[PDB]
Write a protein that binds this ligand. Structure first.
Ligand SMILES: [Zn+2]
Ligand SMILES: [Zn+2]
Lengths: 601, 596
């Protein structure tokens, strides 16, 4: 049976011309071949047996909503910029010169946001319109509302649901219920922990599919609490800044509880970050920094965020400032509506090793990505006007607080193809001409991101993206097109590859030079041979790393699990005595089970 | 642009022949026309506010998964019974002689079940395999697991999630938390009501799409509690039956709380039923019956279930009540319903009743063969590892019926010339009553033969037919023109809005409910309001005496823009005017403007 999809004549002509030029195999690699045949797709899915039937109904329509989104983006770009520019983008997306993230969602909903819970506390759940819900009056109903909000928001967006001020609002309800005698003192710590447990297990127990929503928590230091909440009041009229020491103590209690709970059961969410202010050789909140250094000795389960100023966060709750990162540590009231990534190894292959030629091609392709992002933003505005995205109508997601993102991947592999990498006793490194080359690539992307605000009327950022699927897909398309000239099976997501032996001093130096050029849109893994021998050792090393200008980092760890999910180190579980079956490590910046995750890439 | 869907040659040929015979309009009416064009469907969806983007991703693939399910059911019928039979079933589904329920899910997952919570209390959530969960130790974590269970089960099935023994298990956690000093004796009622509030609001606040899952609660009388749980024990070793009076008291407390909560905010779920044993003119638990009668006076929000025996629930041919609205017995369900269009057969017969009865018997025999094929496909999916509620002992396949549905009994009779009107109002003729007797007796003869033919048990239901009642009438008008004068077909023995006298309605239900073993509902519109409890209770007894098995009374409930429930034109809470009304249309209370 042949079934019709109704496209304009010009788009049919383009798709036919591209099939002529590249062949059916190119379409098959991009997800637009036999995946569109519902019968073949279904009979393959049911025979692959972990997965249950709820996954089928989510996956079956993804090729069809991708095809729709690519058509709608072509239509809009043709209207804004002309037919030639539109045709150029569709060709670049199908052949792999660029990568459109969340492509099955791209003409329908936005990427991510880091939320404040103030509207939830004051107004309840106003975005659910079939019933009127009253604002919470006690701790149990506050916790219920937080869970419902996370689940709602994860089906109105493709990426992370961030909650950096969670502990600020939880403290209010703890104190209220204590003063009222709802919670007796002799039961206060029991009560707090039982709510920690309900929230945490809910965020790791998937109802549909086999994966939970992606969530983030942040430990806010005393400087951050004070700068963000100056002037603001709780619903009882008291000043939030009058309660800083109680908020700090509730944050410390959660971090201690979760470190103990991992022996009983290992889990991924929420992803943990600590945000610290550091200047001229010292931490401005030294008590919090020493605390995080102490608790991390067990599992290294928390990522370090370091900043030298709180100016950007003072004014959060026209050019946009504030940190945006897809792993964790995005500032309160900041997000991104869409990411589109440039394939850097492709440009290396096209240039023949001529660096001036490389920089010309790069500048043109970044200009193309800006016009595609502008068109996607116009489509999101349409959806808001059509009544389809209530998080925007109700003041939770804010469009004027979201960037358009220019992504990068394969920096190392690109330099390697150009002839600009080497090795010595201290491991893999860039040549002297290589460090200059990377300087020039990032400075050039930055120039164009800045010009965009005056060109298009909104703000652009740059990220070295996690690239969970793109790192594999881009390398495969390049090998299809260029053969043995492209010798890598996967591209890298850090300045030096995750599993390279590069001296710690060189690694730290490189992140010191280049994190600032992407305004904190990256992460560094520190390669420590042997575990830390003492607390003071660890702390001296943290201070060294911060001194050199690294903005976001985490220490290496390899955590074992048994078949019943207990976490430990070594080959035999100390709880039940069974052998290890897998291990948890950071592959794209957060702790995951490695065999399953690597299969999923 | 054209996209290929890869079918066997014989199915391709069949679909081409049916398009030639009936034309593209018949395919459009069945959902297999321009609904399959992704671009048209998307641009139509987005320009229509109640719905949001989460609805789009659920609706876009339904035409495609229906087309796949129709093909797979054809393949399995061909394997089991030959190509002629498989071809006949497809023609009947496309042209409206039959109606396959939940058609977009029919080769992927099953319809419904009424669960016990024993395995949840004893094992936690083992059907979620990516993390290991421990059984609940306290009331708050028990409430959490019940919510998570309902949401998980609603995405592994198409129809209702029933929880008839909820209060038996909630009581154990109340008792344990009292014994362990978690909550003092004097703050007990406040603690209980906080948990009623969390559970109830979660079951009325949709996360994906704009509708919550369909859920049911049952008030079990003292007879039912004693018979179901004889010899059974709680996790602490004590006998369930030593606590009958505590369970009854906790059930009464919920029924009182939810009646008061409607003024604060009106909502639908869970749908409420009370199950009572009644024999030789008397309720055998009179205390509970009088309580239900008393509490119903305000909103008439509970449906009455009447039975004469507890033998079936006391424990290969399956016995136990199955109903799509509410009151399905503990550990009973259905894997699929396929409904017969009775007005079609009236139109095909030309008014000859022996011809009608011959066509009917053949069409029911075809429905049995299609149900048997669906069941074989469900067994395949269980062995592929796709349906974990069966592996984990929550859904049980030998406790599910295959269901033969009916709709349009009255309109069928009208077209045949067997209805009239007199001083009593609209009614069946004498010959018409005997005709309905014969139609129901024929269907039941074939339902009983199927056990020996196929090795599993069949039931009958007069279904709610929310969408089928409209689409089947439309298809018949397309094929027969002015000979089919009705805009919609009926889901009760006489139409709800007809002028029939109430004694007539009650008489028909008293005759015919027993023939479909309780798979029906009688609901009566109240004019004024009851003046006293005693008159209400005598009416309830009168209806029970006549043999009616499931019934309710209908009031007209007003709501304002802020959501408060009341009677009349102006709100006693906030002073604003009425903007809509809640009423019982197919068995459960819904906002009337939206039901459209
Ligand atoms: Zn173990
Ligand atoms: Zn009102």
């Amino acid at each position: 049976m042949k079934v019709q999809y109704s496209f304009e004549r010009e788009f049919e002509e383009l798709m036919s011309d591209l099939l002529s030029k590249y062949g059916y195999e190119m379409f098959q690699m991009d997800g637009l071949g036999d995946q569109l045949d519902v019968v073949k797709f279904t009979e393959d899915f049911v025979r692959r047996g972990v997965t249950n039937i709820s996954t089928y109904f989510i996956e079956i329509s993804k090729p069809h909503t991708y095809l729709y989104s690519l058509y709608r983006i072509w239509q809009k770009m043709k209207e804004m910029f002309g037919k030639g520019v539109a045709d150029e983008f569709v060709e670049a997306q199908i052949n792999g010169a660029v990568y459109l993230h969340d492509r099955h969602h791209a003409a329908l909903m936005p990427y991510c946001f880091a939320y404040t819970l103030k509207p939830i506390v004051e107004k309840g759940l106003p975005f659910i319109k079939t019933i009127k819900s009253e604002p919470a009056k006690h701790l149990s109903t506050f916790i219920q509302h937080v869970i419902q909000f996370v689940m709602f928001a994860s089906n109105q967006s493709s990426g992370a649901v961030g909650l950096p001020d969670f502990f600020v609002w939880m403290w209010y309800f703890v104190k209220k219920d204590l003063k009222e005698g709802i919670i007796p003192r002799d039961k206060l710590d029991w009560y707090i922990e039982q709510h920690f447990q309900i929230l945490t297990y809910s965020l790791n127990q998937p109802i549909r599919t086999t994966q939970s929503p992606y969530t983030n928590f942040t430990y806010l230091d005393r400087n951050y609490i004070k700068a963000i909440f100056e002037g603001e009041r709780y619903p009882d009229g008291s000043l939030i800044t009058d309660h800083v020491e109680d908020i700090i103590a509730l944050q410390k209690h959660y971090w201690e509880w979760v470190s103990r709970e991992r022996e009983r059961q290992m889990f991924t969410f929420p992803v943990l970050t600590a945000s610290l202010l550091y200047k001229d050789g010292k931490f401005l909140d030294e008590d919090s920094a020493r605390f995080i250094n102490k608790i991390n000795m067990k599992w290294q389960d928390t990522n370090w965020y370091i900043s030298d100023s709180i100016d950007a966060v003072a004014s959060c709750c026209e050019k946009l400032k504030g940190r945006m990162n897809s792993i964790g540590g995005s500032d309160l009231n900041i997000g991104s509506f869409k990411v589109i990534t440039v394939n850097l190894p492709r440009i290396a292959l096209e240039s023949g090793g001529d660096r001036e030629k490389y920089l010309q091609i790069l500048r043109h392709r970044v200009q193309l990505i800006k016009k595609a992002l502008a068109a996607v933003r116009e489509i999101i505005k349409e959806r808001i006007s059509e009544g389809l995205l209530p998080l925007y109508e109700n003041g939770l997601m804010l469009l004027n607080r979201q960037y358009g993102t220019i992504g990068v991947t394969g920096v190392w592999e690109s330099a390697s193809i150009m002839g600009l990498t080497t090795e010595d006793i201290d491991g893999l490194k860039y040549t002297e001409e290589g460090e200059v080359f990377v300087d020039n690539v990032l400075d050039t992307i930055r120039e164009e991101a800045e010009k965009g605000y005056h060109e298009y009327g909104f703000t652009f950022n740059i990220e070295q993206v996690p690239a969970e699927k793109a790192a594999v897909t881009l390398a495969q398309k390049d090998r299809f097109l260029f053969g043995e000239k492209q010798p890598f099976e996967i591209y890298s997501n850090q300045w030096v590859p995750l599993m390279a032996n590069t001296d710690v001093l060189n690694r730290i130096r490189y992140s010191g030079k280049w994190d600032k050029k992407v305004s904190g849109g990256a992460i560094l893994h520190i390669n420590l041979g042997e575990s830390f021998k003492t607390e003071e050792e660890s702390f001296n090393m943290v201070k060294m790393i911060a001194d050199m200008g690294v903005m976001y980092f985490a220490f290496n760890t390899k955590i074992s699990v048994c078949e019943d999910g207990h976490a430990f180190y070594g080959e035999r579980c100390p709880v039940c005595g069974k052998a290890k079956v897998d291990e948890y490590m950071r592959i794209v910046g957060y702790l995951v089970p490695v065999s399953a995750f690597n299969k999923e890439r």
